[PDB]
Structure formats: C-alpha cells, structure tokens
C-alpha cells in the first residue's frame, strides 16, 4: 500500500567542507596499579600513610579484622561448636576468593584516603635484592608487623637463590616454567599449575623461621604476602587476555561445575562483612568482570616481551620435542617442601629441582585429581638418553621447620609434548608397585600409551567401578 | 522417590550408586543410639584416606531429608573407625 506524504516532513540539506572536537569525559575514577619501582615521594608516602593507619585501626574493617579470614585465628564458620579455616585451597575456584580479598583491601585503602591502588612487584625480571620500599629500615611499617593475636614478630628468611637463580634452558627457571604454564589452552588445566606456582615461592620467601609467611597461620599478616596475590591476579588477567584471542573460552569450564554456584564465604556473612560490594558480589559467575570492580592495570608486558613474543615462543618451544614428569598431591595439613632426585637407567642421581606446599591445620581436606606437570628432562638431555626411557624418582620431604615428615606421595607419570602437535602424550607405567594414583582426568585428545618392562599384563575397560569388587 | 540409607554398622551395600531423576536422599539409624552425623569429602583420595574435615561443614544429620545437586559425592561416616570399616559410598545425582 501507498501512504500520504503528509506523514513525513520535507528533508534538509547539509554541506561539510573537507579537511586537508568532542571532549574527553569519564575521568576513570578507578584506582590503578603500578610497578613498585616506578613511584615517587608523594604516592610512596601516601601508601606508607595508608599502611600505618590501617595497622593502627582496630575497627570492624581494620587490618587484623580483614586479615583474619586468611590465616588465623580460624573464625570459620560463624558461631559453631568447633572452628576451621575459611581459606579456599586445592579447589579450582581458588582465584575468586583471593580476588575478593584484594578488592576489599583496595576498598579499605580508598576509605583510608590513598588515591593510588596496590602496587605490584614482578619476580620474573632478575632482581639483586627486594625493593627498597619494603627493605627499608628507617621506620618502615612494610618491613614487619607485630601480631596482636599470636603476640609474636614475623621473621623474614629470604632464600638467597632468588638472586643467583639457575638459568635453566637458557632462561630463568621461574620465567620458563610460568611460560610452560601459559602455553596451556585449557582453563582449569592451566589454573592448577597456576595455583601450584602461587604455592611455590611462598616457602622460598618464608625460608626456615616458624614465624614466617611460609606457614598459613603466619602468612596472612605481611605486605609482601598481600601484594603477591595482586601480582597473581595480574598474571591471571594477562593470561586471560592472551587466551581470549586464541579462539578458546576461559570462564566456561566443565571440570569444576559444582563449586561455581555457591556464595563465597566468609564474604557471604552479614556479621563481619560491612562492605556492600563484596557482600553482594559472592557469585563466581559475576566475579569475573572487573568493570563492576573499578580497578585496572597500566601495562601488561613481561620481561620486556609483549603478547606476540609469547604467542610465538609457545610454538618455538613446541617445535623442540621434550618429555616431562607429573606428580599427584593431596592435603597434609601443614606447609612443607619436597626435593626430587633422579634414579636414571643405570646412572648416578642428578638433582633437578624441588617442591613446595602451603597448608594449615584448619584446612578443608582436598585433593588434586589433575596431574602436576614438572620439568625433569634437563638431566635427560644432559645424559643424552632417549625421551621414551625408563628410570625412577626419589623424594625427600621436609616441613619448612626442618624436620622429617611421613606423608609421602604417589608415583610419577610421564607426559611428553610431541613436536608440532597441540596434544600431549600420557604413558602409564605397569610395574609391580601399586603406587599410581587411583583416578586421573585427561585433557582433550591426549595420546594414551602403556609402558611395561616386557610383565605384558594388558588392561580392560570393565565399565563399572563395582567391577572392582 | 526417596532413598533411605540406615547408619548400618557394616556396609554390604554396593560401593557406587547412580540415582535417577527426582530421588531425594535420607539417612537413618537402625538403633536410636546411632544418630551420629555423616561426613562428605568429594575426592577419591579423601575416600581412600578418610581425612575428617573440621566442623560440621559438608555433613548430613540422620532422619533428615535432603535434596542434592547434580554431582558425585563420596560419602563417609563421621566415625573414625568407619574409615577402616569402609563406609565409602559414592552417589551420583541424576539431573538428566
């Protein structure tokens, strides 16, 4: 049908001459995070002021009140017959709890008055010493705090190896292994090694003294401890932004379905959670976004190496085929460490590296179904033997206090990265020792193989766990 | 439907059960003196080690109805002797 022209008004003519503005609103009222060694007098004094008055505060949102949720004195749960720890460990929903802790700390800082967010320190770059802002002794509150609860002083045992770090594979060991974690294209399979690396240097900087952050009870009351998790958040977010352009989702995960749909605790409590933001942001589905959180970084480059450098070095290292080991770990209830030593095929032992675990007495028991990948092949190409070789491991386990322990761990497994192939290969050894872990989850399309000394006992998929009985 | 497991002193029940859609879970006690709590762990290593979690967190009271979300629970009785007894009952909730 046609319509009467009175329904639309006659147009108008405009003429813009060719070339050869609008303002800038939204001053971005979000606190921002800078590198620790890129600051000046005004903001360093502001951070010192914020720290001193948060220490001095004894209110519901004081330093002790906000840090009691992590290490001590086990105010978890709300008014029960017995108390455990609210600390979330061993579970792939780990980062959310620490992220909410950090945002609550930043809200406390903003309430105090500091306009600049928490600083972050990078350990990937070589460092001869820890930053002067925290190593200073001329009345520096960052150095140490005297706990009111336990009535003790926190010791500091920095491992000297963090300065003369061994250069494994022509690179820093720590940077190399964090790159090997970043190479993972699957969310939870990445974040398990991610949390492992979170755990690693905790014992390194804790050292030996009991009154140190190495144990979880004394961990929760140090500025370095509370900036470590900010750095962890930074590395998590940069991994997110690297992975989001490789055509692979990051939030969605079927490996930890059950745990994503519970309010975070004790942040869900009303008794001692004054902040409405972290009161109402208990849902892990909505934790991921940061626009509602109002905090952001400035630069994401690491070691002078931008996103493309990692995006190419991933395949640069996948071109060189290499085999690696894998352990399986479970909670023990105390922070400790382990050192692994080789037993090669008719050869002398070769030292490669170590192991580190953070735990507490009030921990909620957990387990790691996913294997932890580790790099034991430096000695392998040192000895020149083939990757598909046969050997053994030995473990020396010791708590950070420096005494022998008894909670041993299961036998290793072997996983190799085929050249030019995205998948890995998982080989299970069939021997006379039943030290292998019971159940394992496997990444997508990973090659499967079975090794035997000959003892050619095959295996059958029975189809039921009841077939065990 | 509802499945009711009494707090039996010994467990002859098959270790694993795969429930159907709409099947609530209830715990019972053959003797009224055996009304103790029952624990949950959620991992096979905890199944084979019986590490008792502190507090009442992840624990169910007998003679109480429960609806459980889709998941696999490796239920163990709160008793430490039940660890060696072997009351590891795996339950897989059906959500179709």
């Amino acid at each position: 049908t046609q319509l009467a022209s009175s329904l639309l008004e006659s147009p108008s003519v405009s003429f813009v001459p060719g070339k050869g503005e609008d303002p800038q609103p939204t001053k971005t009222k979000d606190v921002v995070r800078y590198e620790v060694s890129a600051l000046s007098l005004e903001q360093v004094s502001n951070l010192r002021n914020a720290l001193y008055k948060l220490q001095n505060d004894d209110g519901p949102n004081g330093y002790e009140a906000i840090a009691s949720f992590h290490g001590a004195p086990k105010l978890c749960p709300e008014n029960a017959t017995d108390r455990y720890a609210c600390c979330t460990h061993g579970m792939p929903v780990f980062p959310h709890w620490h992220r909410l802790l950090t945002v609550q700390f930043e809200m406390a800082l903003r309430d105090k008055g500091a306009l600049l967010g928490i600083p972050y320190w990078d350990w990937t770059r070589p460092s001869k010493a820890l930053p002067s802002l925290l190593t200073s002794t001329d009345n520096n509150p960052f150095s140490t705090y005297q706990i009111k609860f336990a009535q003790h002083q926190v010791t500091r045992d920095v491992q000297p190896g963090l300065y003369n770090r061994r250069k494994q594979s022509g690179l820093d060991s720590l940077f190399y292994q964090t790159l090997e974690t970043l190479e993972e294209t699957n969310y939870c399979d990445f974040e398990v090694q991610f949390e492992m690396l979170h755990n690693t240097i905790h014992a390194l900087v804790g050292g030996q003294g009991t009154y140190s952050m190495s144990t979880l009870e004394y961990s929760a009351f140090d500025p370095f401890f509370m900036i470590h998790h900010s750095s962890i958040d930074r590395i998590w977010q940069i991994w997110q932004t690297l992975q989001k352009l490789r055509h692979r989702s990051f939030n969605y995960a079927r490996c930890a379905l059950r745990n994503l749909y519970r309010p975070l605790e004790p942040f869900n409590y009303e008794s001692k959670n004054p902040n409405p933001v972290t009161r109402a942001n208990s849902r892990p589905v909505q934790i991921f976004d940061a626009s509602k959180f109002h905090y952001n970084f400035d630069n994401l480059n690491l070691n002078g190496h931008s996103v493309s450098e990692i995006n190419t070095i991933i395949e640069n290292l996948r071109d060189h085929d290499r085999v690696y080991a894998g352990f399986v770990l479970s909670g023990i209830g105390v922070s400790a460490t382990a050192n692994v030593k080789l037993v090669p095929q008719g050869g002398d032992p070769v030292d490669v590296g170590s192991f580190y675990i953070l735990g507490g007495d009030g921990e909620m028991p957990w387990a790691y179904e996913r294997v932890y990948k580790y790099d034991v092949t430096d000695a392998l190409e040192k000895l020149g033997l083939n990757a598909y070789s046969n050997f053994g491991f030995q473990v020396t386990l010791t708590k950070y206090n420096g005494e022998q322990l008894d909670a041993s761990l299961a036998t290793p497994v072997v996983i190799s990265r085929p050249a030019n192939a995205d998948y890995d290969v998982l080989i299970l050894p069939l021997l006379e020792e039943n030290k292998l872990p019971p159940k394992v989850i496997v990444s997508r399309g990973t090659r499967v193989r079975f090794h035997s000394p000959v003892l050619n006992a095959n295996v059958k998929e029975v189809g039921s766990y009841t077939s065990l009985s | 439907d509802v499945l009711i497991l009494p707090l039996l002193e010994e467990n002859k029940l098959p270790p694993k059960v795969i429930v159907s859609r709409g099947t609530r879970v209830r715990f019972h006690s053959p003797v009224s003196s055996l009304n103790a709590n029952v624990k949950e762990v959620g991992s096979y290593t905890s199944l084979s080690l019986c590490s008792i979690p502190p507090g009442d967190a992840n624990s169910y009271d007998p003679d109480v109805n429960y609806s459980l979300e889709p998941g696999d629970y490796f239920f163990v009785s709160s008793n430490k002797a039940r660890c060696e007894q072997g009351t590891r009952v795996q339950i897989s909730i059906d959500d179709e």
Binding site: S37, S132, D138 | -
Partner: protein, 46 residues
C-alpha cells in the same frame, strides 16, 4: 639529617624521575654574567 644510606635511597629513587633539562655549552665572556631562560608554547608560526 640524612646519612649515607638515606642519601643513597634518595639517589636511587631520584634516578627514576623524568625531567626536562636545558643543556648548556658555555665558555665565559671575560666577565661574570647570568642567563634567564623562559619556556613558551610551541607556536612557531593577536
């Protein structure tokens, strides 16, 4: 009131600052004199 370590920490924290410098190549004209210097907007073209 600053000791060796104090002036040290000051020097490392100062090395990171970003500055605008005037570089001078002077020689002397046989008499003491002073120079006053001023900055203006980059307008090289009322």
């Amino acid at each position: 009131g600053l000791n060796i370590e104090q002036l040290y920490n000051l020097l490392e924290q100062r090395r990171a600052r970003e500055r605008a410098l005037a570089s001078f190549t002077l020689h002397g004209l046989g008499f003491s004199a002073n120079v006053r210097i001023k900055v203006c907007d980059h307008d090289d073209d009322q």
